């Protein structure tokens, strides 16, 4: 999970 | 979503394991810059433009000069009335054997000025380094961070570029590797430490009672932290200034800053  | 206060309450006064989410509008309502809003520009540019991988690549020294400015600011800012009401909260349930943490998306450590003990940094933190050679992370409050950036950072459109070469921007000091130094910050595009994130789904877990407050809820993974804990019968307050497209997913919607509605929502 990427921080958007 | 419900707007009774009263309703939240009584889950609170039976809640023993309380996760409250904070974002940007908790600094936000302390005068904190967020480059995020309405939130403030550095010079010409937002945190979306200067808080990426790309940013950094390309001129380390305008990455370090905006979070030198954004590390001197916090000098002058203040936890407000929803810090404090966070962090009272903690210590007087703490003695009643009851567990307040909180997951927080900000990065100037306002949560730990107003006394919060249980705080899980997802983002990092504006007065923590990390090594890209080594890795190693580091607290760091120094002012200024290194000698260069003195009186650099100034944050007016216009200023000039401090262009501090590489070698006298700050540096790890761990004997043998003097490699360069980043903000312990995650960008917009990196992966969140593993690490923390296990312990991000261990309180979503074991909690009875979750708060969303100032999160627009438009940042990933933050914005899922909640719906994966309402589905589980665990009731998720929202305390926001506005709607967020998180909101018709939440058991309570509170209008209004977070300093007005968490004091009687802590209390
Ligand atoms: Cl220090
Ligand atoms: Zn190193």
Same mark, same amino acid.
């Given at each position: 999970?990427?921080?958007? | 979503? %419900?707007?009774?206060?009263?309703?939240?309450?009584?889950?609170?006064?039976?809640?023993?394991?309380? *996760? #409250? #989410? %904070?974002?940007?509008?908790?600094?936000?309502?302390?005068?904190?810059?967020?480059?995020?809003?309405? /939130?403030?520009?550095?010079?010409?540019?937002?945190?979306?433009?200067?808080?990426?991988?790309?940013?950094?690549?390309?001129?380390?020294?305008?990455?370090?000069?905006?979070?030198?400015?954004?590390?001197? *600011?916090? +000098?002058?800012?203040?936890?407000?009335?929803?810090?404090?009401?966070?962090?009272?909260?903690? =210590?007087? &349930?703490?003695?009643?054997?009851?567990? !307040?943490?909180? #997951?927080?998306?900000?990065?100037?450590?306002?949560?730990?000025?107003?006394?919060?003990?249980?705080?899980?940094?997802?983002?990092?933190?504006?007065?923590?380094?990390?090594?890209? %050679?080594?890795?190693?992370?580091?607290?760091?409050?120094?002012?200024?961070?290194?000698?260069?950036?003195?009186?650099?950072?100034?944050?007016?459109?216009?200023?000039?570029?401090?262009?501090?070469?590489?070698?006298? &921007?700050?540096?790890?000091?761990?004997?043998?590797?003097?490699? &360069?130094?980043?903000?312990?910050? *995650?960008?917009? +595009?990196?992966?969140?430490?593993?690490? #923390?994130?296990?312990?991000?789904?261990?309180?979503? @877990?074991?909690?009875?009672?979750?708060?969303?407050?100032?999160?627009? %809820?438009? !940042?990933?993974?933050?914005?899922?932290?909640?719906?994966? *804990? @309402?589905?589980? +019968?665990?009731?998720?307050?929202?305390?926001?200034?506005?709607? =967020?497209? @998180?909101?018709?997913?939440?058991?309570?919607?509170?209008?209004?800053?977070? /300093?007005?509605?968490?004091?009687?929502?802590? @209390?």
């Amino acid at each position: 999970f990427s921080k958007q | 979503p %419900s707007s009774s206060m009263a309703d939240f309450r009584k889950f609170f006064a039976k809640a023993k394991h309380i *996760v #409250i #989410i %904070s974002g940007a509008g908790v600094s936000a309502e302390s005068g904190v810059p967020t480059f995020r809003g309405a /939130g403030g520009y550095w010079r010409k540019w937002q945190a979306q433009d200067l808080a990426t991988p790309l940013a950094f690549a390309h001129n380390p020294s305008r990455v370090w000069e905006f979070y030198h400015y954004r590390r001197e *600011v916090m +000098g002058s800012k203040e936890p407000n009335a929803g810090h404090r009401a966070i962090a009272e909260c903690e =210590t007087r &349930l703490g003695k009643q054997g009851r567990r !307040v943490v909180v #997951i927080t998306q900000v990065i100037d450590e306002l949560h730990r000025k107003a006394g919060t003990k249980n705080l899980l940094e997802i983002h990092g933190s504006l007065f923590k380094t990390r090594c890209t %050679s080594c890795g190693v992370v580091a607290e760091n409050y120094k002012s200024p961070i290194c000698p260069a950036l003195s009186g650099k950072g100034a944050p007016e459109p216009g200023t000039q570029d401090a262009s501090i070469p590489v070698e006298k &921007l700050p540096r790890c000091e761990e004997a043998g590797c003097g490699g &360069l130094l980043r903000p312990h910050v *995650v960008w917009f +595009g990196e992966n969140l430490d593993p690490a #923390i994130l296990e312990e991000v789904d261990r309180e979503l @877990a074991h909690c009875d009672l979750c708060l969303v407050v100032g999160t627009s %809820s438009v !940042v990933y993974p933050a914005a899922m932290f909640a719906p994966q *804990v @309402a589905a589980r +019968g665990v009731p998720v307050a929202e305390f926001n200034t506005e709607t =967020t497209p @998180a909101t018709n997913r939440f058991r309570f919607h509170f209008q209004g800053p977070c /300093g007005t509605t968490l004091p009687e929502a802590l @209390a």
